[PDB]
């Protein structure tokens, strides 16, 4: 009867004001942990990436959505936890660049080598390196790339593209910013063109705008990239209904879901943080975004559908899901939008975790690419940045600050948690590039 | 039997610019982690607290002192890690107060009950609660309290005093701030008075200033608190030499080392962070304090002396060590001092890991009381707060920012933060947990009833 446990409940077990009422543990965990350690090979791997979800962003989201003594049933249910560094490299000197951008970090884990901010699947010498997705696929596994951002964003593109600059979304941008990658210059092409060639069995996300561009050379010159996809035998679905009608997705008929021109709609609506906002304004109570839709698939729905379609492959699969806008609303000083995306990712982690729990051979990892600006401060705080007071589930006020156009990333080490075989490799201090080797090893590649 | 190992080396394996060059792991950790789990009785416990040492402070200190791919022999060597919440309570409402202060958090782990910012050893109803040190000592276990801040500070005070306000350092303040605790009003006493009452075998730290205060009641009225200490059996020490000469420390010969009027000297010195400093001012290299003196013991030295004495007790011991100035300097927006204090603490963790690794039945816990405001930001950053560019061990610049305040100091923050542990019952720190869990994990580990 061996079954690996998932933290079923680590909420304040009682009365916050009373002795022991705030404890989250009801007994000794030594046994539960032992039952969580396995070195058996992992058949599948699901990697949930919260863009910019550092410990501060997690605590901010729990506080507001579940209450300080709350528990995220997905994000906090992962038994093995640790901390990992994610610094970039200075392209010229080759020294550490203490604060990474999404592209550099995304490469470190998907390819195993450090790089300079902005690089996508290339090292400082601009040399291409096979990403974990290309390798999983080479070994005959199924591959899935899901996100709530544009498939050209740093995190998803990192698994299927090798360009010198993240800004090379399509032919238009590539000719000018990545001339060496420009298809008409003998290169591999733009991120979108490379994505189309990588051919993952399932790719769900937004960023359909770029697919309207036409190739400047090659076999599909003059055809829009959307037409290319179709000519290459792709299944294009553009809404929840059709996404759900897909019975199978493979290499003969790979799926491509373009659910929005840019980023898919945010979950909650709310005002932007403001200078001395915590005082010049009443507490904010986030409200559901009316554009979220009954037709726009939610992140937990894409994770669920992709898991379904990918589990047909007898050999196994590799999946990457990105709760994307947490990073964006963080950059936008919009507490509600930021918090909503976190809750949104929690629902996704839940699905992945329920599956992994029954299959017994899945490695589920939840982490972030880099930390962000958001900080939870005292109610009466008078900071120089932008602040906003929110009404938390505890019926209490929580103040948030953004003080570093937009808010930047920070280089603090952040949480990384896992569940399943080889999850033991996330405990303690590790580096982001370690994630590549952990996955390469668990999946049995090479 | 494979007796629990520490993470030997988690430093970047090689050339960080090559594939797998920045890796920290050499192989699979599964087996290594299996041998680190033990639910057997912990004979002793050592709790190293870093005031304001969140993941952000840890990083900055590492980047600077050992390079990004560097590794902290102490702090980073603990095998079992996790993240814990430390929210406080709003006294009047009983509702959560997301950003705790030093007082409420220290109380949280020493007594296992949540309280309000400012309180020490009492809940929102002002009722007292026995602390882990009072309990430990009550079981016959030798106990020690060590800090580099003044001994009346929140962290060391929370272990021996129960007052409704951290400000109640001595007789004077207490009379006006904690009336119900004022010895004249039948109160149990000021922080310092209760300190002396607590009688911990080993007590080392600064804050001799309040010891000059004179009692206003009790069997020692008119006598200064220092005179009282001596008259009660305490053996005073004011410098490294005399600290080193001390061979015994127990219940009838308790040790009390006061090495400063206020807090002790900070390890590294450096200029203050300034508006756009990273842009308008050069990269700082931290300058060792010329005045830390050979006459003043370091945290590591105090830790080792404490362990030398406390271990002579056959029953076992409880030790809390506090790397104090990180928080204060973090408040001061003084990068170099903040980093110096994290380095100072790392050496102490190394000392403790050394003892535990040998003894084999010692739980060592390394955590912080709450997260602070410092963040590591991009070098070309134009923030609204105080910023400073430093010269790290890598020969590259790192910019720290302080921008959560426009008032006198840099505030605390409510983010969940790292907690690491090594030894029997270390498994209880993995995953998400609350600061109050730390009390129960310790009490249960020590077998305290
Ligand atoms: Mg991204
Ligand atoms: Mg303290
Ligand atoms: Zn990011
Ligand atoms: Zn970002
Ligand atoms: Zn503190
Ligand atoms: Zn403080």
From Swiss-Prot, chain A:
Q: Does the keyword Transferase apply?
A: no
**Which positions are annotated as binding Zn(2+) 2?**
51, 369-370
Per the entry, the cofactor note is: Binds 1 Mg(2+) ion. Binds 2 Zn(2+) ions.
Which Cys-Cys disulfides exist here?
168-178, 286-336
Active site at 102 (phosphoserine intermediate)
Report residues binding Zn(2+) 1.
327, 331, 409
The enzyme class is hydrolase
Q: Which GO terms describe its molecular function?
A: alkaline phosphatase activity; hydrogenase (acceptor) activity; magnesium ion binding; oxidoreductase activity, acting on phosphorus or arsenic in donors; phosphoprotein phosphatase activity; zinc ion binding
> Which one Pfam family would you cite for this protein?
Alk_phosphatase
User: Which reactions fall under this protein's catalytic activity?
Assistant: a phosphate monoester + H2O = an alcohol + phosphate
- Give the UniProt keywords, A-Z: Disulfide bond, Hydrolase, Magnesium, Metal-binding, Periplasm, Phosphoprotein, Signal, Zinc
The cofactor(s) it depends on are: Mg(2+); Zn(2+)
Q: Which GO terms describe its biological process?
A: protein dephosphorylation
Q: Where is it predominantly found?
A: periplasm
Q: Which InterPro entries match?
A: Alkaline_phosphatase, Alkaline_phosphatase_AS, Alkaline_phosphatase_core_sf
Ligand binding (Mg(2+)): 51, 153, 155, 322
Q: What's in the GO CC field?
A: outer membrane-bounded periplasmic space; periplasmic space
NCBIfam families membership: PRK10518.1
Recorded hits in PANTHER family, A to Z, give: ALKALINE PHOSPHATASE
Q: Which family does it belong to?
A: Belongs to the alkaline phosphatase family.
The name this protein carries in UniProt is Alkaline phosphatase
From the UniProt record, report the name of the gene that encodes this protein.
phoA
């Amino acid at each position: 009867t061996p079954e690996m446990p998932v933290l079923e409940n680590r909420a304040a077990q009682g009365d916050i004001t009373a002795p022991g009422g705030a404890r989250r543990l009801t007994g000794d965990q030594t046994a539960a942990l032992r039952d969580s350690l396995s070195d058996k090979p992992a058949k599948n791997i699901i990697l949930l990436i919260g863009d910019g979800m550092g410990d501060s962003e997690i605590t901010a989201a729990r506080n507001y959505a579940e209450g300080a003594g709350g528990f995220f049933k997905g994000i906090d249910a992962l038994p093995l936890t640790g901390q990992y560094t994610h610094y970039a490299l200075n392209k010229k000197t080759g020294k550490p660049d203490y604060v990474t951008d999404s592209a550099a970090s995304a490469t470190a884990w998907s390819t195993g080598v450090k790089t300079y901010n902005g690089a996508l699947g290339v090292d400082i010498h601009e040399k291409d390196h096979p990403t974990i997705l290309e390798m999983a696929k080479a070994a005959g596994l199924a591959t899935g790339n899901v996100s709530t951002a544009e498939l050209q964003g740093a995190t998803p593109a990192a698994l299927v593209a090798h360009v010198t600059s993240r800004k090379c979304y399509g032919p238009s941008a590539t000719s000018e910013k990545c001339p060496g990658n420009a298809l008409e210059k003998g290169g591999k092409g733009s991120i979108t063109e490379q994505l189309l060639n990588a051919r993952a069995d399932v790719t769900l996300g937004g960023g359909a705008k770029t697919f309207a561009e036409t190739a400047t050379a090659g076999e599909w010159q003059g055809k829009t990239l959307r037409e290319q996809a179709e000519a290459r035998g792709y299944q294009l679905v553009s809404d929840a209904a059709s996404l759900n009608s897909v019975t199978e997705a493979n290499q003969q008929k790979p799926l491509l879901g373009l659910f929005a021109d840019g980023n898919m709609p945010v979950r909650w609506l709310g005002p932007k943080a403001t200078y001395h906002g915590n005082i010049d304004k009443p507490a904010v109570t986030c409200t559901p975004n009316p554009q979220r839709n009954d037709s726009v698939p939610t992140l937990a729905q894409m994770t669920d559908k992709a898991i379904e379609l990918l589990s047909k492959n007898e050999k196994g699969f590799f999946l990457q899901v990105e709760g994307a806008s947490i990073d964006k609303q963080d950059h936008a000083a919009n507490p509600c939008g930021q918090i909503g995306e976190t809750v949104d990712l929690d629902e996704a982690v839940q699905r992945a975790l329920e599956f992994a729990k029954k299959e017994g051979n899945t490695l589920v990892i939840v982490t972030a690419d880099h930390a962000h600006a958001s900080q939870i401060v005292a109610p009466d705080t008078k900071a120089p940045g932008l602040t906003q007071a929110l009404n938390t589930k505890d019926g209490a006020v929580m103040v948030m600050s953004y003080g570093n156009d937009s808010q930047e990333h920070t280089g603090s080490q952040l949480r990384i948690a896992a569940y399943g075989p080889h999850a033991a490799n996330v405990v303690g201090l590790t580096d982001q590039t370690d994630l590549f080797y952990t996955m390469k090893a668990a999946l049995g590649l090479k």
